[PDB]
Amino acid sequence: SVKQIESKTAFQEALDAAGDKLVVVDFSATWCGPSKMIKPFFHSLSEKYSNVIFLEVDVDDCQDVASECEVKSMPTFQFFKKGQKVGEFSGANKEKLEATINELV
Amino acid sequence: SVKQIESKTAFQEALDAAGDKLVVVDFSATWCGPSKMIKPFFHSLSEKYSNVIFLEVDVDDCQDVASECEVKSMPTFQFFKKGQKVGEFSGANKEKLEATINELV
Amino acid sequence: DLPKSYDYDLIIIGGGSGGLAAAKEAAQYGKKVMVLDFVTPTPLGTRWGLGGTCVNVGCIPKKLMHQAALLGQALQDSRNYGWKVEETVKHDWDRMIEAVQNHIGSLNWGYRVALREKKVVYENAYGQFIGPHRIKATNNKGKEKIYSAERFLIATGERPRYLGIPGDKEYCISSDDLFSLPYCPGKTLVVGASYVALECAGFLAGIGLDVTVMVRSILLRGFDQDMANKIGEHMEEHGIKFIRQFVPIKVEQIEAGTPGRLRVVAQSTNSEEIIEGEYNTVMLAIGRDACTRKIGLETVGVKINEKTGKIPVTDEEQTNVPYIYAIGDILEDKVELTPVAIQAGRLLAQRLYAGSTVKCDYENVPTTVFTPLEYGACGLSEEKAVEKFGEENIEVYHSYFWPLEWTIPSRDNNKCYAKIICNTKDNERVVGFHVLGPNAGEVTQGFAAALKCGLTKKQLDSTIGIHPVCAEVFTTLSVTKRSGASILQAGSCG
Amino acid sequence: DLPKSYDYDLIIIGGGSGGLAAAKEAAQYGKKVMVLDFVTPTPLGTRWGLGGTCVNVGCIPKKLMHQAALLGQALQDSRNYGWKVEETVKHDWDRMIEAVQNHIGSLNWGYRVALREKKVVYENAYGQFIGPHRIKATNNKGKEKIYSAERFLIATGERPRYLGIPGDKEYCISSDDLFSLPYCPGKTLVVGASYVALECAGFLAGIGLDVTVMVRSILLRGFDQDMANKIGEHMEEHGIKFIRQFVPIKVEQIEAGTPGRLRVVAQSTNSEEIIEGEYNTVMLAIGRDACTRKIGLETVGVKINEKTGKIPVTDEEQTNVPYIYAIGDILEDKVELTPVAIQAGRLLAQRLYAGSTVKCDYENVPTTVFTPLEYGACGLSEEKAVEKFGEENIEVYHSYFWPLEWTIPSRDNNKCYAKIICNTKDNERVVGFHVLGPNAGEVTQGFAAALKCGLTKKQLDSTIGIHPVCAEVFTTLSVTKRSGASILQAGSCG
Ligand SMILES: Cc1cc2nc3c(=O)[nH]c(=O)nc-3n(C[C@H](O)[C@H](O)[C@H](O)COP(=O)(O)OP(=O)(O)OC[C@H]3O[C@@H](n4cnc5c(N)ncnc54)[C@H](O)[C@@H]3O)c2cc1C
């Protein structure tokens, strides 16, 4: 299942709590078409890849996280390893998403 | 029935051949909405008054008869007696038309 | 009394049109900037994101709903052009609000991304001076914090004014609430005659709603009155009902709902006569008040006009206090428009950190009221021109026009109106420009630039028009009001 | 030798845009005028009424069909604003033609009535000079007649040019025939790259038709090329198919019809490669030829450019012969636009019968190409500006813009483009203005007046924009092409 992190303190709390495990962050906005389109797949992928940590950061709710991470457009998927950005890409491309997970997992 | 006069001669010929009978001329245009809206009533009215002579003059086909009768708008109805103008008004007001015919019979 | 070091070169109070523009220009020159932006909730709790009035509850959503109204008319116009559309097409309020807010959100996000891009610090909190060069900032959870800066910029804007009558704050909405209304307004009463009032009444009616406008006195005070009345006249012809010389004294809830039923009790402006009507929604568009009274200006010494709440500034937007500037709607005797706040802010930053001496020019700022029939204007209104130069020195050239796009749908001939105000004295300067028609704003912009260049009737007449375009009507104006000649063009069939 | 008495003071050959304008001004001053207007049929027999090219087979019908195309997009845009509009609405070609012709008819009539009003004599006949101050006129039934006049005005305009290849005149249509086409064109091939070719291809596609454009070399010759390619790029991006470096050599009829089936064989412009395609209609938009070779100019001595067919005139539209003037499209090195012909005619009449000394100004005449994405321009194009002042003295300020109206439908961001050409020499004069976007013509008009006043970048930047309007993009241009900085706008998701 996906973690609907809802706090700038919670985001860093989530990453630090992850450890060595790859953390997948879905930066989304309910006002972005492609972001809403891919959301269902991001969640179906979290039920497939149990080994990985799935987080969802609504850019409107956590204006902090999203801002701190240098996010430009939605959707934007970031991969953190030991609280360190070790993978990133924008776009609602599910193939590139699932493929990037394996690459880092 | 209505007579589609197509010439200045056919026009003077209709005016003379009418004798003392009232003659109503409908100055019209195929591209003029109000003209089109009134056409039916005019034609149907011609059938209602067999005691009157109904003529239709298309301003694009009989350009001279229109300028000679000094027409600036459609629908424009001109009434004649013994070849002389006794009635006239512009507009697609059927009540006024049928009423003017009744006042000149 | 004063920090040994400022946390910033410039702190901006208010992340609206002027503030955000100001912030980016300053940063552009490596200055350390922080924008404080907070949106205190409307009485019903509505709130929104970064961007300011225009972005969230002003220009943007209003023009979008206006477009929605225009598209309704387009559906109708398209039939005659050969498009097989149904006779009556329903409109969905919730879908519209959704699309409108979604776009607003992209804009909110857009501004947050832009600030960071310029490394400008943004703090979603209410800023308030406490002492020289010092400001307090409170966030959503009540967490205060103090900051110091070499300079400050007040760009707090304004918010909807209420009537101060029983039930207005608990049952009436303002423009602040309209643009994100959770349900279709239904039968609506718009109270006011400002451009907000008319524009809103117009698109609401444009989308099928039962609309009524209650006016205290005249329409669009501040604008050319002949145009204003032509606007009202057009609104009236198109469904919008008007109730003149009346002001609400009390609003009572008949039944709560989404929407509910409200009962409005209004009194005459010239008598004790009282009238009451039942409506689903009641919007108050009666003006806005400057947000300059709860930001600790006293603790810093910046003087403002205590009555109006406006802030007096020099021609460089500097208050009475050397390191404190102000821009936007709150300025006294300026122009309350978004593009204006942006120019002022950008130029301020350039004068302060780029060595520029160019000042914002508040003279002859063009405007456009997006009512059903749009109205664009620049320069002096007619009445205002006679006062300034004298009735005998003013020649008014005018004419009606019929947009070609309207001929096939066969509607509204002799509605669109154009007029320029010329100053005979010397060389017939075009001191005023007014247009009532489609895309009025697109039509007025270039002409505003022309007035900036000192356009004269001679130069205007020498300019060739573009055919077939509405704007060309201005290149061939020959009929004056003084002549009393007709300008009433004839119809299709003559 | 000379008629004891001239039948008229002024006889005008050609009842088009300039002629009719000329006629009314002259009459306005009690002069005796006669307008001779006749429309020789297209090869397929098409003909029309009084008014000229623009009224019958030019500006008017083309902009109306263009609007029809725009309304199709409006139907789509509306769904997103909340109007419960069907996903796919079908268009009716015949209904459109009907409505279009109906409007042209009201115009044909308006002119006959306006001429009779000014006591101007209108004769539906082909004029041909026979001798000094004498002209012959032939009507529909071949009835000739001679007239004399103190002065004559040649305002005959032009007509579509053909390829002079097998089957073009018997199977291909021109703009002269398109606007009243008895049936829907179906799969269409537009041959040419002039504004007529592109505007026509655009609205045809706009209404659902399969469209292809065969081009010999460059698009919109004579126009700023970057804009032209952006136009073509937008047309292609929107379904319009292009075939570059090819010109038809032969057109053949597979099967007659309404529409029928036509085979087009075209060779390459730089090789021997031949390609063939099947289409229902083939329109040739490859230019127009002056109607100055069959009107007996030799019998009166008026010299014209034998190659191009244009008529050389003084800056007052006077030919080499003292009592014979010429205006409109047939003039040499002028501006072939309707408003131009009208100005010239009106001013000519005022100089001749009102004692005016004002000449028509053919400098910096604005224009608008009504392609899917409209293009308005005034002044020098970019390439033309470097040539005149030097590459190093030209600063080009540009920017993309996204019409607010397009945000909710969420389409075409970074498409609309704006640019001005500035002359660094002394004051950064705005010598060129170019816009690609909605209502380009409404946007360009005012700015044309501004260029007339000598608008500079400084004055432009000092002008405040109208928000939220497309045109405002011109008041805040800061990014030059020389800097190479980027000008893309944020999308729906940023
Ligand atoms: C319904 C409506 C329609 C409009 N339509 C148009 C139009 O079509 N065209 C046009 O040109 N103008 C229009 N306007 C006006 C335009 O929106 C304003 O002129 C413009 O927003 C003013 O800019 P500003 O920077 O002065 O203030 P604003 O944009 O109002 O921004 C002020 C910001 O500062 C914040 N703030 C206030 N106090 C504090 C504080 N103490 N600490 C921190 N933040 C604070 C506010 O909450 C807000 O975010 C419209 C207005 C309304 C209400």
Ligand SMILES: Cc1cc2nc3c(=O)[nH]c(=O)nc-3n(C[C@H](O)[C@H](O)[C@H](O)COP(=O)(O)OP(=O)(O)OC[C@H]3O[C@@H](n4cnc5c(N)ncnc54)[C@H](O)[C@@H]3O)c2cc1C
């Ligand atoms: C498809 C198309 C689209 C266009 N769109 C635009 C636009 O959007 N904006 C714009 O400004 N311009 C546009 N134009 C150009 C515009 O139509 C012309 O610039 C304008 O019509 C020129 O005016 P004129 O008076 O020179 O001639 P015309 O209007 O062409 O009139 C000449 C008239 O004289 C008649 N005539 C010719 N020979 C004789 C003779 N021997 N005796 C008697 N009568 C004669 C003709 O049949 C005609 O009625 C367009 C043109 C075309 C073809």
